[PDB]
Amino acid sequence: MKLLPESLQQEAATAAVVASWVLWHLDTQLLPTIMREHKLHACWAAAAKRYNEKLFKLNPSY
Amino acid sequence: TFAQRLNSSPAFSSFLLKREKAESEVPPSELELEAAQKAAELEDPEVALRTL
Amino acid sequence: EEEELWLLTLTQQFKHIQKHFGIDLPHSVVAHMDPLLIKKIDWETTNALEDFDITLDDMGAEDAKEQWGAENLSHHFLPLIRYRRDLARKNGDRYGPDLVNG
Amino acid sequence: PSQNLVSTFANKVIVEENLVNVAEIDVPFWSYWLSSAGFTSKDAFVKFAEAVKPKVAALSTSDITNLTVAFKRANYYDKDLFTGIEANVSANFTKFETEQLLQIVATFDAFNHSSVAFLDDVADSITYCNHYLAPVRAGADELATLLTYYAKNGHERADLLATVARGFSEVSLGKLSAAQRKDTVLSALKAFQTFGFYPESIEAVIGAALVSPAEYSAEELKEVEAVKVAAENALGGEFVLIQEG
Amino acid sequence: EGNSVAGIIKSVNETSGANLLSSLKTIKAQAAPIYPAAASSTGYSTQAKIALFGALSWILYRADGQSKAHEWIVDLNLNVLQAAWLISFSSLIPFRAVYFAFRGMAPATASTLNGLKTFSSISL
Amino acid sequence: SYSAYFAKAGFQFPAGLSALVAGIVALNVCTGRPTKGTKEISNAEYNATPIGYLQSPDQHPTAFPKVPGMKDVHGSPHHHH
Amino acid sequence: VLGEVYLKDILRTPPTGAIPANVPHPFQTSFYTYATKKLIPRHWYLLGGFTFTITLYGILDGLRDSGKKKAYDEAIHAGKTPYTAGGH
Amino acid sequence: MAVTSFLGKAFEKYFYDFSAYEQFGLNRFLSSKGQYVALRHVGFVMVGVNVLLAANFPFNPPFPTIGMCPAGWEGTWVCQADKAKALEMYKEWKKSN
Amino acid sequence: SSVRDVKTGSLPTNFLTGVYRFWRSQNPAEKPHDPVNDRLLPAVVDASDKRASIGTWATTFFCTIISCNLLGLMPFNEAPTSGLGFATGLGVSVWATATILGLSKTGFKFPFIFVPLETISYTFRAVSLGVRLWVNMLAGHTLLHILTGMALALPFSLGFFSMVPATFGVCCLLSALVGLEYLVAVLQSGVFSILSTVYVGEFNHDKFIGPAAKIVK
Ligand SMILES: [Zn+2]
């Protein structure tokens, strides 16, 4: 069957172009979007006890 | 409610979720149903003033 | 009604995120409502700390995780303490929390 | 006549008077990159500083950073330009990153120029409008410049000092040469005692001098151990160098 | 576009007491957020036609070279075996259970937002 | 609410797909070698040869061959056996 | 009062006029910011590994044609045809 | 029609409620629907195999037969195991047929 | 110049969040001796500056291989990872990334008769990481070509839609091998990226800088 390709360097460079595009697309397009909505939730869930206690001490409405 | 806001989201108008309901996975609780109904009364800000 | 603009902007903005986050809120409306939270989140992605809350969870830093969340929303209190500082400067005094021993 | 035509072309077309006539369009681009190539030329930076003054109020934050560090390297202090720059920073303080503000302050610390509204809007921006680990990415020679600029102008902001003192560690001081670490440790301890603020990370800038005291004199180590005893009771304890074992 | 609370505060301050309670639904709706209305369809974008013609240009080109492949009837009967599982996956994958299972992979959607607990931010 | 804002923008490609397709095509056309079943000849041979004799039978297999190995063209009968 | 000059560019309400454009990340804006701040400081090990494979597989492609040229010349300097005469 | 809007509405009602597991009854013979789909699957393959073969039947098979012949052929070009042999026999058969 | 707008809580955003947080979970950061506070925060940020981005690299290799492996199960398509240079070119590139990372922990100088035997077993994991991906994508697809040639021999020889219990038992065996190929397509993209975190994570170890001076009590 077909085992070796016509060029091994052309198939190795197709793998490096595809995997460096996925590296670029993940780091630039996906992971900024992942972390913008992961860390809105995460900063709000980590600050929620200290945010509300700091806000309780600040507003004079009570 | 949360499941009622999921049903009108763009995810459930998609093809593979079009005949689905978000309440079928986790139904709204008894407090979530009674507080969506209480919040429907208070979307009139005159009703919210006279109640308060 | 002296500081009611700040306290009701906090209330209306969080109620709109909470109603819509994870359901249909666009990322453009988040970055409109909270531009400095998106600015500080983008600093972690730019400076290769996009897993910093996973790093603090790996090393069990539960009080540095609470400081990480609190320092990323610390600009929510900036419209107040810029107002209260411009009160105390107009009344000749010093702002309290600006001082070390005050 | 080939050499004559080239020499005639060189004395009327490629001079520095037409080099500053193409440099009138975008000023802070051309101001920044020329000054990085050693083009100091104090009469040319006069010509820069007036063609940019109708534009400083509408510049982006990376343009304002490009103006100030160019006019720091050119060492030309245009005071009615530099109030337009601090009115760009004070009007857009939320948009300035603290990597950019530490280069703007070090220009404003060279030419001793400060407002009180500028000193608050830089401290409000580093503390609240910027990531809290962004002092850690700064490099301690720029943070010590910011600490003295708040101690020269007598501006006590204890929230800013807790932010800038994050950026002092063994990591950030270890990236400095021991000549530059010495000019920083003495410059950061002189500012930390001016406000009397002794954070828990003052033991990394004190400890940067007590592992290698042989580059310090006697009155400088008298200046260091004045702060060391002032910090040990403030932090409620006793100083001890760690040796790794 | 200034903020809508300062639009609420200004528009409640400049009403009389007689028409305060009548005005409260037009001040409510002036500060409601915009949810843009369902526009005209105009389906299949300029890139949705490149995606469908380019996938048809790929499927025809791959079926062209499959048909002269020396095992052409073996190759063309493998597309029947492969497309049989695409059919059997639309009828067996629980697509609502999968949607809520991916929704729990992300901590942003596995829980509700947690800050700002309404007693801390009152203005009395 | 907000559901009709996300229906307005239709399909869209990934945000740098043009650099993937230009990168995969530029690896398949800038091979630096003849195009898989052809051989470079001189211009004196190319101008002298018919286009039926320039073709090889191996490079034109039959589109749905009734016998495995059927070819569409026959090429040059001037064989060097 | 606290009067909206203090909330400017700090806290905004949900938009009422139109949904704005999304704020780009600095990496989506320019490839030069991605390349110099993240691709080269953080992923140069991965780019070095893709570079090693493309050069190594160019060695093995160079060995395979120098082995084809070796077996080709030992058929034309042996009076044989260097392949199986096509098949058709 | 709108060429985008009609077929989506058409395929959806074919996809969702058009069920030949109920419109043809068929619960009388099969236990579940989980094994009606495991026979429509194998039924799709057997129909697809029998269509691809029959849509061009007089062909010499590339795949190895096990010494079996389709119909009354048995010595013709369709059953020949040598492929250069069957090419010569197909070219004789083609001018006659 | 204008980026697109993203809905929060999209399904591709939730899948890639869970995928990235999975591969980041494989090489976790180590807890220091000291408590993490503002004193230890530059030592934690510098500890993250010196760790490789294996959370990003392993989901680069997960998403580029599961997309290539599942192309082989789409009709009219072959998997790119059934090519020898593609699949072994990803395996050498992971192994070289681990080695370039392990060579930079020093000053790029390469490390009695024991060490040629540690090296061999180490240099073979260049070969084995890519060949395992290549052979699994080749040997599953090759067997499917053979058994659908043998399944085609029955309706070719016998009637069309005739003697159907013979072809039914081999059409369900063919259908159960395409189903196993969906399992091998997802497993081999998982095993490639699990092993990439193991190999690259061997050299993912640096010194915690930490406080060199302390005010105790
Ligand atoms: Zn195939």
Chain C CA closest to residue D134: C43
Cα→Cα distances D234→C100, D196, I37, Å: 12, 9, 18
Which strand (E) or helix (H) includes residue G45?
helix G40-76
Best G2, G45, G46, G50 residue to mutate vs chain A (most A CBs within 10 Å): G50
Cα→Cα distances F46→F33, F53, F55, Å: 18, 10, 11
First to last CA, chain E: 27
Instruction: Locate H18 and state its tokens.
Output: 């058009």
| Helices D116-127 and D140-152, packing angle to 10 deg | 140
The DSSP letter of residue C47 is T
Instruction: Locate I156 and state its tokens.
Output: 């070719």
Cα E61 from Cα D65, distance rounded (Å): 55
Residue E70 to chain F, least CA–CA distance (Å): 6
The reply to whether residue B45 touches residue E100, judged by beta carbons under 8 angstroms, is no
- List strand residue ranges (DSSP E) for chain D, in order: 238-241
Q: I2 CB near a chain A CB, below 8 Å?
A: no
Contacting residues for D15 by C-beta, under 8 A, at least 6 apart: none
Q: C83 CB near a chain E CB, below 8 Å?
A: no
Cα→Cα distances G19→C30, E28, E39, F3, F4, Å: 10, 19, 15, 13, 12
The DSSP letter of residue A62 is -
Cα A8 from Cα E16, distance rounded (Å): 83
Burial class (CB in 10 A: 0-12, 13-18, 19+), G38: buried
Annotation-wise, does I205 bind a ligand? no
Residue I196: Cβ within 10 Å count? 26
| Residue D109 sits in the same domain as residue D74 | yes
**DSSP secondary structure string for all residues of I159-188:** -TT-SHHHHHHHHHHHHHHHHHHHHHHHHH
Provide Rg for chain I, Cα atoms: 24
- How many C-E residue pairs are in contact by the CB < 8 A criterion? 40
Q: Which of D135, D156, D190 is the last residue of a domain?
A: D135
Cα C55 from Cα I31, distance rounded (Å): 9
Cα D228 from Cα D189, distance rounded (Å): 9
Cα A60 from Cα E121, distance rounded (Å): 10
Answer whether residue D196 is part of any domain.
yes
Instruction: Locate I114 and state its tokens.
Output: 């024991």
Helix, coil or strand: residue D239: strand
**At residue D16, what is the residue type?**
E
Provide Rg for chain B, Cα atoms: 15
Cα H31 from Cα B23, distance rounded (Å): 29
Of E4, A28, C24, I123, whose CA–CA distance to F4 is shortest? C24
Q: Which of D135, D156, D174 is the last residue of a domain?
A: D135
Cα I91 from Cα I79, distance rounded (Å): 16
State the number of CA atoms in the 13 A half-sphere of G42 facing the CB. 24
Cα I75 from Cα C28, distance rounded (Å): 38
| Chains D and A touch, using 3 or more CB pairs below 8 Å | no
How many angstroms is it from G74 CA to the middle of ligand 1? 37
- Cβ atoms of F10 and E45 closer than 8 Å: yes
Q: A35 CB near a chain F CB, below 8 Å?
A: no
Residue A54 to chain E, least CA–CA distance (Å): 9
Paired residues of D238 in beta bridges: I216
Cα I50 from Cα I44, distance rounded (Å): 10
Paired residues of I213 in beta bridges: D241
Residue H22 to chain F, least CA–CA distance (Å): 35
Cα→Cα distances F81→F37, F57, F60, Å: 20, 16, 22
Cα E5 from Cα E2, distance rounded (Å): 9
Burial class (CB in 10 A: 0-12, 13-18, 19+), I30: exposed
Paired residues of I215 in beta bridges: D239
**Interface residue ranges in chain A relative to chain I, Cβ cutoff 8 Å:** 1, 3-5, 7-16, 18-19, 22-23, 26-27, 30-31, 33-34, 37-38
Instruction: Locate I157 and state its tokens.
Output: 């020889």
Number of domains in chain D: 2
Determined by which method?
Answer: cryo-EM
The reply to whether residue H59 touches residue F65, judged by beta carbons under 8 angstroms, is yes
Residue C85 Rama label (left phi>0; alpha psi -120 to 50; beta): alpha
- Cβ atoms of I94 and I191 closer than 8 Å: no
Torsions phi, psi for I82 (to 5 deg)? -90, 5
Instruction: Locate I73 and state its tokens.
Output: 């199960």
| Residue D34 sits in the same domain as residue D124 | yes
Torsions phi, psi for I214 (to 5 deg)? -145, 145
Cα H63 from Cα I145, distance rounded (Å): 9
Residue H14: Cβ within 10 Å count? 11
Of H72, H82, A3, H59, whose CA–CA distance to E73 is shortest? H59
Best B4, B5, B7, B9 residue to mutate vs chain F (most F CBs within 10 Å): B9
Of F66, B41, I40, whose CA–CA distance to D242 is shortest? I40
Cα A20 from Cα G1, distance rounded (Å): 54
Residue I24: Cβ within 10 Å count? 22
Contacting residues for D216 by C-beta, under 8 A, at least 6 apart: D182, D186, D209, D224
Instruction: Locate A34 and state its tokens.
Output: 């992942």
The reply to whether residue F66 touches residue H60, judged by beta carbons under 8 angstroms, is yes
- Cβ atoms of C29 and A16 closer than 8 Å: no
How many angstroms is it from E84 CA to the middle of ligand 1? 15
Cα G57 from Cα I130, distance rounded (Å): 13
| Helices H37-54 and I164-200, packing angle to 10 deg | 110
Cα D67 from Cα D47, distance rounded (Å): 13
Residue D147: Cβ within 10 Å count? 26
Cα I92 from Cα I99, distance rounded (Å): 10
Residue D183: Cβ within 10 Å count? 14
The reply to whether residue E3 touches residue G12, judged by beta carbons under 8 angstroms, is yes
Paired residues of D239 in beta bridges: I215
| Contacting B residues, span 11-50, partner chain I, CB-CB under 8 Å | 11
Residue A46 Rama label (left phi>0; alpha psi -120 to 50; beta): alpha
Q: F5 CB near a chain C CB, below 8 Å?
A: yes
Cα D10 from Cα H43, distance rounded (Å): 86
Instruction: Locate G6 and state its tokens.
Output: 């203090």
Alpha helices in E14-117 (DSSP H): 20-30, 46-66, 72-76, 78-90, 95-102
Contacts of I44 in chain C (CB under 8 A): 55-56, 59, 61, 64
Cα D112 from Cα E104, distance rounded (Å): 56
Helix, coil or strand: residue E107: coil
- Cβ atoms of D106 and D73 closer than 8 Å: no
Q: H26 CB near a chain I CB, below 8 Å?
A: no
| Helices I84-104 and G40-76, packing angle to 10 deg | 130
Instruction: Locate G63 and state its tokens.
Output: 């060995």
Q: C17 CB near a chain F CB, below 8 Å?
A: no
- Cβ atoms of G57 and I85 closer than 8 Å: yes
Burial class (CB in 10 A: 0-12, 13-18, 19+), C13: buried
Cα I203 from Cα H61, distance rounded (Å): 55
Cα A15 from Cα A8, distance rounded (Å): 11
Chain H CA closest to residue E93: H34
Q: Which of D84, D117, D135 is the last residue of a domain?
A: D135
**DSSP secondary structure string for all residues of chain I:** --PPP-BTT-HHHHHHHHHHHHHHTSSPPPPPSS--STTTHHHHHHHHHSS--HHHHHHHHHHHHHHHHGGGGSTT---GGGSHHHHHHHHHHHHHHHHHHHHHTTTS-----SHHHHHHHHHHHHHHHHHHHHHHHHHHHHHHHHHHHHHHHHHHHS-TT-SHHHHHHHHHHHHHHHHHHHHHHHHHHHHHHHHHHHHHGGG--------SEEEE-
State the number of CA atoms in the 13 A half-sphere of I163 facing the CB. 12
**At residue A3, what is the residue type?**
L
The four Cα atoms B16, B19, B21, B24 give a dihedral, to 10 degrees, of -90
How many angstroms is it from E79 CA to the middle of ligand 1? 8
Instruction: Locate E26 and state its tokens.
Output: 């037009």
- Cβ atoms of D83 and D54 closer than 8 Å: no
- Cβ atoms of B13 and F6 closer than 8 Å: no
Cα D197 from Cα D191, distance rounded (Å): 9
Contacts of G19 in chain I (CB under 8 A): 5
Cα→Cα distances A1→A5, E33, E39, H84, I83, Å: 11, 63, 55, 20, 12
| Residue D113 sits in the same domain as residue D185 | no
Residue D152: Cβ within 10 Å count? 13
Cα C69 from Cα G41, distance rounded (Å): 27
Give the distance, in angstroms, between the CA of residue H85 and the centroid of all CA atoms in the same chain. Answer: 28
The DSSP letter of residue D200 is G
The reply to whether residue E80 touches residue H15, judged by beta carbons under 8 angstroms, is no
Residue A27: Cβ within 10 Å count? 23
| Residue D130 sits in the same domain as residue D62 | yes
Cα I45 from Cα D118, distance rounded (Å): 30
Answer whether residue D11 is part of any domain.
no
Of G47, G29, A32, D173, whose CA–CA distance to C49 is shortest? A32
Alpha helices in chain H (DSSP H): 5-15, 37-54, 83-96
The reply to whether residue I39 touches residue D235, judged by beta carbons under 8 angstroms, is no
- Cβ atoms of D151 and D191 closer than 8 Å: yes
Helix, coil or strand: residue E124: coil
Annotation-wise, does I141 bind a ligand? yes
The reply to whether residue A10 touches residue F31, judged by beta carbons under 8 angstroms, is yes
Give the distance, in angstroms, between the CA of residue D131 and the centroid of all CA atoms in the same chain. Answer: 18
Paired residues of I7 in beta bridges: C26
Give the distance, in angstroms, between the CA of residue C47 and the centroid of all CA atoms in the same chain. Answer: 20
Helix, coil or strand: residue G27: helix
Burial C21-52 (b: 16+ CB within 10 A, else e): bbbbbbbbbbbbbbbbbbbbbbbbbbbbbbbb
First to last CA, chain H: 46
First to last CA, chain F: 79
Residue F64 Rama label (left phi>0; alpha psi -120 to 50; beta): beta
Annotation-wise, does I145 bind a ligand? yes
Cα H30 from Cα H39, distance rounded (Å): 10
Range of the domain at D144: 136-242
Q: Using CB atoms, which residue from E103, E112, E116 is nearest to C10?
A: E116
Give the distance, in angstroms, between the CA of residue I164 and the centroid of all CA atoms in the same chain. Answer: 42
How many angstroms is it from I78 CA to the middle of ligand 1? 6
Resolution given for this structure, in angstroms: 3.0
The reply to whether residue A45 touches residue C50, judged by beta carbons under 8 angstroms, is no
Which strand (E) or helix (H) includes residue F52?
helix F51-54
Q: What is the domain partition of chain F in residue ranges?
A: 1-81
Contacting residues for D42 by C-beta, under 8 A, at least 6 apart: D74, D75, D76
Of C83, E47, I197, whose CA–CA distance to F17 is shortest? E47
- Cβ atoms of F12 and E49 closer than 8 Å: no
Residue D112: Cβ within 10 Å count? 10
Paired residues of I8 in beta bridges: none
**DSSP secondary structure string for all residues of B4-51:** HHHHTSTTTTSGGGTT--GGGTSPPPHHHHHHHHHHHHTTSHHHHHHH
**At residue A33, what is the residue type?**
T
